[PDB]
Symmetry: C3
Subunit: 336 residues, 3 copies
């Protein structure tokens, strides 16, 4: 492309929405390449992650853990204005696994409190990708403190299955999975700290055991269950984007399946089909497409069941509709 051409492309600002929801977008690109603008303010803040009042000094892109999903199409440019308020105490930056060059952008976006920066990159590869903060020397600490999210770079013509047939979803959810490593005192009680840096030494010791104290979705145990369960209806097509910036996970829609799963998260890699449990390595995002056939409650979990039911990696889906006795039926209900 020429220099003037890039400068002449339309610029479009988008209003982000907090996970698990996703901002307005079209599956098939509308018009030619655009420079899609996003702005995110970094917020260091204490959040409670379990039912025992356990605290973590989160480092949250846009104030949420995970950071929000940004959606663009292949060959659009993503132009992000990143802000680090003077009220914060640490330097931060951002690495887009979707980008090319300067460590994904980390080398060009190091901002101290009181500073901002604007990074632009061409989304040349289609798929869902992880993005995360990565200050040299303290990379895992920022990432396991919740400073990561994902973006989706849709093919300009939308999604397709391995045979080239269109796959159009009715709704999309973004489930960011987070491994936390919270220090405990000799009595086994989780410790609280006045400032983020105060917990650094204690936190790294726990990180080295490679064993998280919590593994959660949307920043807390149960954040996506109960009255916050995701929803769908029989017949509805749903895309579930899942990311884990630091550790492996194995998603499974209990009661359902992954009809088409881009396990590696890259759309040019044909999707696996009829999946029970898929695998997303730490440092990546993946996406699963499913058409609901049965109403009721479903569980969506990291299928190491200890991580899901003891550590927190479990969400729910409430589905409306009519039951299908052909697919499943209780011939004889539990009885003496």
């Amino acid at each position: 492309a020429t220099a003037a051409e890039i400068a002449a492309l339309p610029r479009q600002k988008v209003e982000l929405v907090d996970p698990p929801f996703v901002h307005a977008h079209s599956q098939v690109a509308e018009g030619g390449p655009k420079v899609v603008e996003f702005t995110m303010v970094i917020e260091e803040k204490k959040i409670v992650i379990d039912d025992a009042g356990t605290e973590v000094h989160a480092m949250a892109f846009n104030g949420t853990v995970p950071g929000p999903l940004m959606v663009v199409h292949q060959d659009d440019y993503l132009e992000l204005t990143l802000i680090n308020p003077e009220t914060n105490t640490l330097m931060h930056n951002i690495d887009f696994h979707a980008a090319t060059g300067a460590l994904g952008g980390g080398g060009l976006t190091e901002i101290n409190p009181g500073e901002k920066t604007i990074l632009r990159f061409k989304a040349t590869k289609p798929g869902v990708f992880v993005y995360h903060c990565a200050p040299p020397g303290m990379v895992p600490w920022h990432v396991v403190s919740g400073m990561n999210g994902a973006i989706m770079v849709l093919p300009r013509e939308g999604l397709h299955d391995g045979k080239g047939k269109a796959l159009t979803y009715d709704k999309i959810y973004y489930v960011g999975e987070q491994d936390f490593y919270v220090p405990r005192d000799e009595n086994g009680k989780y410790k609280k700290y006045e400032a983020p840096g105060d917990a650094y030494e204690d936190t790294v010791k726990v990180m080295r055991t490679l064993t998280p104290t919590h593994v959660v979705f949307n920043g807390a145990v149960g954040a996506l269950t109960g009255d916050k369960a995701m929803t769908a209806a029989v017949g509805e097509k749903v895309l579930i984007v899942h990311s884990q910036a630091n550790r492996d996970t194995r998603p499974n829609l209990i009661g359902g399946h992954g009809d088409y799963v881009w396990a590696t998260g890259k759309f040019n890699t044909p999707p696996d089909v009829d999946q029970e449990t898929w695998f997303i390595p730490g440092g990546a995002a993946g996406a699963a497409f499913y058409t609901f056939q049965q109403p009721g409650i479903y569980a969506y979990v990291n299928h190491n069941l200890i991580e899901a039911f003891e550590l927190g990696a479990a969400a729910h889906f409430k589905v409306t509709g009519e039951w299908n006795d052909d697919l499943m039926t209780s011939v004889l209900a539990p009885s003496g």
Copy 2:
């Protein structure tokens, strides 16, 4: 199909066999869809898992760990009669990852000791799938007490490679891998209990470390060696089904290979080929197809060698036949 159409389908009662063997079946479906009937009695029993006399309070479908492999064909119906003896102490149920609806069937099959239930579901997706108990509130505990197994839903036309060429096996084996979390006393000695519930609190603490004390095949260290080593002969085609309902595994046939491996366990997903070590995420089953070319003993392991040789994840294959010097030969035997 309507309830009437289903009621008219032929029915076939299958008699299950203990792993690693698989009940009689035909790779290519014989006739149209039918309701395949199975029965399994749940047995809470003590099992010894290592040569130090270590005990586990197993919760075993059909009395074995793993539960038996159930085989049907795509679009047949699987009708399971599940029984929970009055002699047992806990409520149990069953979730088939192969099924669609009510958490895989667990929501319709919760049975207290003294009860039974009959669940029918349509096997709409081809492949190997995990099945496991999942009582609300105590899911991982039952699964890591051995209450899990798998089923195989064969394509009606049998197996095929990525280009459609038929793949017909001479023998099939089912290796169920189990991660156990046995509590120890302050002297590093494994503890024993007189009841399942008695070990609950202690076990959950070990489960949370995400570090199993034992990782075994067919319920115990060395279970599939010696009197129980699997067999084959040079030239024979063997399908090795492998499942792990809670934790990741990486199977590898030492001395052999995975000629065709449906690593995700789903038959509509083309198999990987010429594999040395494949990967099966916790919560799934996979299947490898191999034609033996060399006689002798083979070791089949989870290739995290510590898990295989320190923790117990190792099985043996004794293969008969003529040695092939073209493939491998000792030009010079170990010598001065």
Copy 3:
């Protein structure tokens, strides 16, 4: 082929080079099948793996960790002369995952100090494969002491993508990743031992936690950084072979991508494309192909960031050339 036919085949002696470099070879095979000859002397030796001076009694093929990459073409024969010097104290052998029979060669190459052996096998399957020592009863200990490496069996027609188009690399690097389990004293300080045998009991204890103290590339923290960082240029095509003989890893080229990744390491299995982070299960080798588009420093890591930045699994690439502002540009540098 008969013994006579093989004996008539041409023979080529190859000089091995130390990782991460690879001995000279041709991507497209030169002529017909050949007996490719390699010689490796095993050296039990003390090595330092970090800046603090932590010692490990390595068991090293060719004196390095990982052992060197051997390259042949499909259907060539690999003839290895393996020597166990009388200065060593343990018995050693070798299992080539690329071979067929006798536990990969392990059952035919057990040599005590002062002995040697020559093993020949036909490289029937294309791909990168792990090779490692495996003495009955002491398997994981030799492997996690560094006694493993990899080989590459190139298709006779060189590499191609999943659609048949040729993929020709300009450079190739072999990154061997090693999980180490070093004992610590009551002060949390790593222990040193006079003889390798002295460390066995303490080491096995650490091995059983399934938590390595160090995870490194080319035998040491920072081994592939600074003056030893890998190098490339904008426009250059690089193949990165990565192996892990005992534990899972998830490689990621920070700032770049895996344009084509044979994640399972087998060339007849179509490669995934546009990868951010790929996955190689313990007990296997994988390979990624990338054409650099941006100059500057890149980090190549196991993307569980704790393993990368706390445990040692991070390498660097220095890349020469012109920055591409179309791909990425800082619209606004960090500022107030």
